[PDB]
């Protein structure tokens, strides 16, 4: 009919815009600055790199860790980074100068994961040493050591007001902790216990998104301790692969995958809505831009690049 019209899209159309080369070993994490201007990457090459979020332009390299870095995270004001390294330390960095402000010492094995609280006065870390540590940003001192897990801690994240921390571990548990006291408020262990390789709070703090090493992501209502959504079809049995809530356009879940693709699901229906092809190794990390429909993806040693993808919705 002459009245036929183009239907409103129900899937995104992410397309490759830039490939970011410079790391010399596997990329381990990518994160967008809260102000939207920058992308930070960490690598097994012991370096952090900063790139422009919209143009993919290399900006600077930040260096000082003695061994590879598994995770990097921004402060709320986009002025600081914290990194987690195999050298058993975290470092706090002034992004503008590239200088190390503090070295956070206390973990007894690799530090795998890190995050600032919303206020950005605290940092949370998780380690192969099975502990979660809470650090004061201004002093660099460890405030609390939580005997959180019985195997390596794969992820740590604060909720939206900082009052809670969620941790995950290869022990098969996710635990929720009261930040102020360090007490465990809940353990999620519904059914059997495959290693949990990633967890984060949803942006409203009412759910947790958790990855397990059986090719499965789950959205849990942890206040009810019930699984609301399951996302499958990707490959994840080996690596601690980040996942994201994409909120700028359509409401998606985004993850890397061991088949070298970026997977995007419809959060509500659980349908795979896009698979982004181009990387030549496992996609270990993805990040979603805070205001624009932009995904960054990063891959392991056969690839060593970060890709920026943009969608109309």
Question: Can you describe this structure?
Answer:
One of its GO terms (cellular component) is ATAC complex. One of its GO terms (molecular function) is histone H3K4 methyltransferase activity. This protein has 313 residues and is mainly beta. It has no helices and 28 strands. The protein has one domain. β15 and β16 form a beta hairpin.
Give the topology, please.
Blueprint: E1 15-20, E2 27-32, E3 38-43, E4 47-52, E5 58-63, E6 69-74, E7 80-85, E8 89-94, E9 100-105, E10 111-116, E11 122-127, E12 132-136, E13 142-146, E14 153-158, E15 164-169, E16 174-178, E17 184-188, E18 196-201, E19 207-212, E20 216-221, E21 226-232, E22 243-246, E23 252-255, E24 262-266, E25 272-276, E26 283-288, E27 294-299, E28 306-310
Antiparallel strand pairs: 1-28, 2-3, 3-4, 4-5, 6-7, 7-8, 8-9, 10-11, 11-12, 12-13, 14-15, 15-16, 16-17, 18-19, 19-20, 20-21, 22-23, 23-24, 24-25, 26-27, 27-28
Radius of gyration: 18 Å
Count the beta strands: 28
Report the total helices. 0
Fraction of residues in β-strands = over 45%
What is the CA–CA distance across the termini? 27 Å
**Main sheet: strands, sense, barrel:** 4 strands, antiparallel
- Global structural class: mainly beta
Strand order of the largest sheet: 1-28-27-26
Integer tally of domains: 1
Basic shape: globular
Task: Give the helix proportion (percent range).
Answer: under 10%
Strand/helix succession: EEEEEEEEEEEEEEEEEEEEEEEEEEEE
GO cellular component, one term: histone methyltransferase complex
Keywords: Acetylation, Chromatin regulator, Host-virus interaction, Isopeptide bond, Nucleus, Repeat, Transcription, Transcription regulation, Ubl conjugation, WD repeat
Protein name: WD repeat-containing protein 5
GO molecular function: histone binding; histone H3K4 methyltransferase activity; histone H3K4me1 reader activity; histone H3Q5ser reader activity
């Amino acid at each position: 009919s002459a009245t036929q019209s183009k239907p409103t899209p129900v899937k995104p159309n992410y397309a490759l815009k830039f490939t970011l080369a410079g790391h010399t070993k596997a990329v381990s994490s990518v994160k967008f600055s809260p102000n939207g201007e920058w992308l930070a990457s960490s690598s097994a090459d012991k370096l952090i790199k900063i790139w422009g979020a919209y143009d993919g332009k290399f900006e600077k390299t930040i260096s000082g860790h003695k061994l590879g870095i598994s995770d990097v995270a921004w402060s709320s004001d986009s002025n600081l980074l914290v990194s987690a390294s195999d050298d058993k330390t975290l470092k706090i960095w002034d992004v503008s100068s590239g200088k190390c402000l503090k070295t956070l010492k206390g973990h007894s094995n690799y530090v795998f994961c890190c995050n600032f609280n919303p206020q950005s006065n605290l940092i949370v870390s998780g380690s192969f040493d099975e502990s979660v540590r809470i650090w004061d940003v201004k002093t660099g001192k460890c405030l609390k050591t939580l005997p959180a897990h019985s195997d390596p801690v794969s992820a740590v994240h604060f909720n939206r007001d900082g009052s809670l921390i969620v941790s995950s571990s290869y022990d098969g548990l996710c635990r929720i902790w009261d930040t102020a006291s360090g007490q465990c408020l809940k353990t999620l262990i519904d059914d059997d216990n495959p290693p949990v390789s990633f967890v984060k709070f949803s942006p409203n703090g009412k759910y947790i998104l958790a990855a397990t090493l059986d090719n499965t992501l789950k959205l849990w209502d942890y206040s009810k301790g019930k699984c609301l959504k399951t996302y499958t079809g990707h490959k994840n049995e080996k690596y601690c692969i980040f996942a994201n809530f994409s909120v700028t356009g359509g409401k998606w879940i985004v993850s890397g995958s061991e088949d070298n693709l970026v997977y995007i699901w419809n959060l509500q229906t659980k349908e795979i809505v896009q698979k982004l092809q181009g990387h030549t190794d496992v996609v270990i990390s993805t990040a979603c831009h805070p205001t624009e429909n932009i995904i960054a993806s990063a891959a392991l040693e056969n690839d060593k690049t970060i890709k920026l993808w943009k969608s109309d919705c």
